[PDB]
Protein: triosephosphate isomerase, glycosomal
Organism: Trypanosoma brucei brucei
Amino acid sequence: SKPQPIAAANWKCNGSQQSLSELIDLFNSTSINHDVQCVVASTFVHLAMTKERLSHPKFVIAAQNAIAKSGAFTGEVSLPILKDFGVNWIVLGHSERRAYYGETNEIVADKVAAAVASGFMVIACIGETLQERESGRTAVVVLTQIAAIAKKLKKADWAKVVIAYEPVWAIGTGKVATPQQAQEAHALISSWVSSKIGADVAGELRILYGGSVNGKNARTLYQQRDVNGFLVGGASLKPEFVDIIKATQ
Amino acid sequence: SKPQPIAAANWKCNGSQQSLSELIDLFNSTSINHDVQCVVASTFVHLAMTKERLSHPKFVIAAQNAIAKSGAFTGEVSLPILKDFGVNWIVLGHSERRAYYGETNEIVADKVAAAVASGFMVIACIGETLQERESGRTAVVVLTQIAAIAKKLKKADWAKVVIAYEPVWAIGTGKVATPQQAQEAHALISSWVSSKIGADVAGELRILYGGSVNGKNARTLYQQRDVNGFLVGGASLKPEFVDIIKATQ
């Protein structure tokens, strides 16, 4: 049987105090009857307001990135800072950061390891690009990405880890992975974890799908054996996020 | 005659709610006898707390970085998000971002132009490395950095620009520029602005020095003709920041 699902909102670099407040209010007013961990990853600027306003019991707040240590890193936010601020969840290695902001497999792995060491729950993102998919390299890409993360972790750290598989070609493009495509990738990742880390670890591991998840396509994706929830971008800034939460059963 | 000086605290990636609250309490209690714009550039996480707790009328809050536009930039903060949050000052192009986070002269220029277009007061950082300085390339390097910025601005926009000259070799190394070194660089920048933009513009431009500024060395730097204040790193997390403010009389 599947572990507890996660429905995670990646608001990315978006939102005003007014618009996010209206969203938070809708979330707060939503009854959710099944066990699902909901997560809202706001910009750093909005953490304070989100921490204050979001009261729904099934939701936790997350950051969208961090660096490992405090220090002379103008513009960046560190894990200790977030921890001191009461933020216990974090999205790391998002493909936008891998593409635009220099995050190699190793940089991601090191961030994930530091976050787990500090006690964070981490949604670690992996996934292939369009070119990688089209060139037939998906499997090696995703396995290499996760193996880099694993290299910096110990078996016990996996209880704090969540993997988000997001094919880059599905992010913001309207081109969602089919249920078959998502399952194929998730089953592959699960097989790797089971073999390298342990069957116990694989069984408890949540592998979330992301990339063009919406209220209409989520239910069918969630029916797949190795899909344990969703990392949602565009739809997470909308009321339909609640329909994605509802699809995780 | 000098324009209004600026004393800017670049807290970098540092601070706990408690430690920064204590610092803010000290700043709030400080009596400042002259016109000076004090600026506290906190991490994004701490903007809410700093905005609320700072009361001293001579202090404004600033961000330490941003990207131009909101959108699918996981982990980043945009100018409109900051503007919506009431943050109207920003530090851009800091050495650490140029060195660690891919900010080329052009990326910095575009950020500065976007910030000015959004209505921000911008502290735009320029400065040469140790190898550039020792090879006699200070002038071409520094002037090329400001020229990139100027390309993207119109004359009137300079009212919203503050230049921070921070030799990279002086950042966190304890090697403060001597008064002669600082003045030579600042005079070069001022002369370039006078030539390229306008004498009036150069006269009203604030050029701040940064790099190992502390309460003891601040005044001897402020005495220089073309030093209009400071961008302070390490010492801005300490009580002696008050002495740096006082040194701008």
Observations:
- DSSP finds eleven helices and eight strands in chain B.
- Chain B touches chain A at residues 10, 12-17, 43-49, 64-65, 67, 70-78, 80-82, 84-85, 91, 94-97, 100-102, 171-172, 233 (CB under 8 Å).
- Strands of chain B lie at 6-10, 37-41, 59-63, 89-92, 121-126, 161-165, 206-210, 229-232.
- Residues 40 and 61 of chain B are 5 Å apart (CA to CA).
